[PDB]
Amino acid sequence: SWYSYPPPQR
Amino acid sequence: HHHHHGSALQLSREQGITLRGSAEIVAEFFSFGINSILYQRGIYPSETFTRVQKYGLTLLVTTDLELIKYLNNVVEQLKDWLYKCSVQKLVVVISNIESGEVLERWQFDIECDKTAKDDSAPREKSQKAIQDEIRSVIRQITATVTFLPLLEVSCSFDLLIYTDKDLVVPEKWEESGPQFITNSEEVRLRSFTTTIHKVNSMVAYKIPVN
Amino acid sequence: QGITLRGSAEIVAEFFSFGINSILYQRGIYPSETFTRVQKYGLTLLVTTDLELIKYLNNVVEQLKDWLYKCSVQKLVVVISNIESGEVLERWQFDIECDKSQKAIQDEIRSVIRQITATVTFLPLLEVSCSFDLLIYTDKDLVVPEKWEESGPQFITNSEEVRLRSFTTTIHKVN
């Protein structure tokens, strides 16, 4: 299982 | 057993590597590791970073408050998962800020010793011995510049975690896919190990077209 | 059967110099704070900024170019070894393809550095002071005086803590 946590939207 | 214990004297003072301490070492690395990729692959402006001494090298870390706050959340979480051996991979996905085309993908495979939590004593490896292995990885990541394809367009990045299907993940983390580059080449890099955790690094890039 | 360096003399020598710089840096033979980035052929390369080393490399690289403009040097072999015991730690072998455009060069450069990096991935962590031995494999015929400029230009160094304790060039006729 993969999970993502994106950084702040520059 | 294993082979690069470090200085016996240093070791006599430090005692050894415990499962928790290993977890910090590894999480700390992903902090510098990510800051380094973002800086050298120019994902963010260079004036955005600042010099720091670590692992016996001069590294650059972000100065952006929000980013700083972001990586910490990742690191602190990465720290929990590693203690329990729940994360198998950590991936930094780089893509075209407009199209969304994945252009470069840094993959980190984590190997953990399930039995380390039941140790009678700390493992015989010095802090310095582990740092030297890490420093060896960071230099290689740097020398990577000459052959990697230039990232001409404006990119963004994403952090992917790969674990065991029975992990209760925080709200900030969302379900996802591997996000492979559709057509690539890859170079397997060096690894380092705390004798409890082992980290293998590698980088994949889209094969130059036109 | 090591890494291949194909091209005109002036170009192969460059490649060698770039290659050797990359090895010195990646393997930690010299300090990181001793290297810098530079542009060349549109790419970025890591090269030393240490004069002693720079002068020396330059001498051997120039002499190398001369033997090269006549398909005289078949290969270059770097032998890294323990300065105390003399045990050999690793050997980097460059094979010369003396075949007398931008884009083309770039691909050659990228692969040389790619092959070097791919290899460091598999070498053991270097942890002792060492000696650098460059072996130039020529044909049987030279304009080298009793081996050369010290019978093989060399240099010693404990300029503090720089893993490289001594670097020496040596000629060797085939057959």
Please give the method by which this entry was determined: X-ray
- DSSP notation for B145-168: GGTSPP--S-EEEEEEEEE-SS--
Answer whether C45 sits within 8 Å of B146, measured CB to CB: yes
* Closest alpha carbon to B198 in B116, B118, B142, B140: B116
The domain total for chain C is 1
**How many residues appear in chain A?**
10
Burial category of B60 from C-beta neighbours within 10 Å (exposed 0-12, middle 13-18, buried 19 and up) = middle
Question: What residues in C contact B58, CB-CB < 8 Å?
Answer: 32-33
Q: Which chains reach chain C with 3 or more Cβ–Cβ distances below 8 angstroms?
A: B
Instruction: Give the residues across from B51 on adjacent strands.
Output: B60
Answer whether B146 sits within 8 Å of C33, measured CB to CB: no
Q: Is C44 on the interface with B (CB under 8 A)?
A: yes
Burial category of C33 from C-beta neighbours within 10 Å (exposed 0-12, middle 13-18, buried 19 and up) = exposed
Nearest-Å Rg of the Cα atoms of chain B is 18
Residue-range definition of the domain harbouring residue C114: 1-175
CA distance B203 to C96: 29
CA distance C66 to C9: 8
Helix (H, G, I), strand (E, B) or coil at B51: strand
The strand pair at C73-82 and C88-97 is best described as antiparallel
Answer whether A7 sits within 8 Å of B172, measured CB to CB: no
Interface test with C, best of B54, B107, B144, B147 (most C CBs within 10 A): B147
Q: Is C70 on the interface with B (CB under 8 A)?
A: no
Q: Half-sphere exposure of B95 toward its Cβ, with a 13 Å CA cutoff?
A: 15
Question: What residues in B contact C121, CB-CB < 8 Å?
Answer: 140, 187-190
Q: Which chains reach chain B with 3 or more Cβ–Cβ distances below 8 angstroms?
A: A, C
Helix (H, G, I), strand (E, B) or coil at C87: coil
Crossing angle, helix B127-143 and helix C102-120, to 10 degrees? 160
Interface test with B, best of C25, C32, C35, C115 (most B CBs within 10 A): C32
Answer whether B161 sits within 8 Å of A4, measured CB to CB: yes
- Partner-chain residue, chosen from C26, C33, C110, that has the shortest CB–CB distance to B147: C110
CA distance C76 to C3: 10
CA distance C18 to C48: 10
Shortest distance, CA B174 to any CA of chain A (angstroms)? 5
Q: Is B58 on the interface with C (CB under 8 A)?
A: yes
Question: What residues in A contact B167, CB-CB < 8 Å?
Answer: 1
CA–centroid distance for B34 within its chain: 6
- Partner-chain residue, chosen from B73, B156, B173, that has the shortest CB–CB distance to A3: B173
Question: Could you tell me the CATH number of the domain that includes residue C104?
Answer: 3.30.900.10
Virtual torsion, Cα B166, B198, B143, C84, nearest 10 deg? 180
Shortest distance, CA B29 to any CA of chain C (angstroms)? 18
Q: Cβ(A5)–Cβ(B172) under 8 Å? A: yes
Q: Is B142 on the interface with C (CB under 8 A)?
A: yes
Under 8 Å CB pairs connecting chains B and C tally to 57
Give the experimental resolution in Å: 2.9
CB atoms within 10 A of CB B179: 15
- Tokens coding B174: 């969302």
Answer whether A3 sits within 8 Å of B172, measured CB to CB: no
Q: Which residue has the tokens 């490896």?
A: B125
CA–centroid distance for B159 within its chain: 11
Question: What residues in C contact B130, CB-CB < 8 Å?
Answer: none
The strand pair at C3-6 and C88-97 is best described as parallel
CA distance C154 to B70: 52
Q: Cβ(B123)–Cβ(B196) under 8 Å? A: yes
- Partner-chain residue, chosen from A3, A7, A8, that has the shortest CB–CB distance to B161: A3
For residue C166, the surrounding DSSP H or E stretch is: strand C164-173
CA distance B111 to B197: 6
- Tokens coding B20: 């928790």
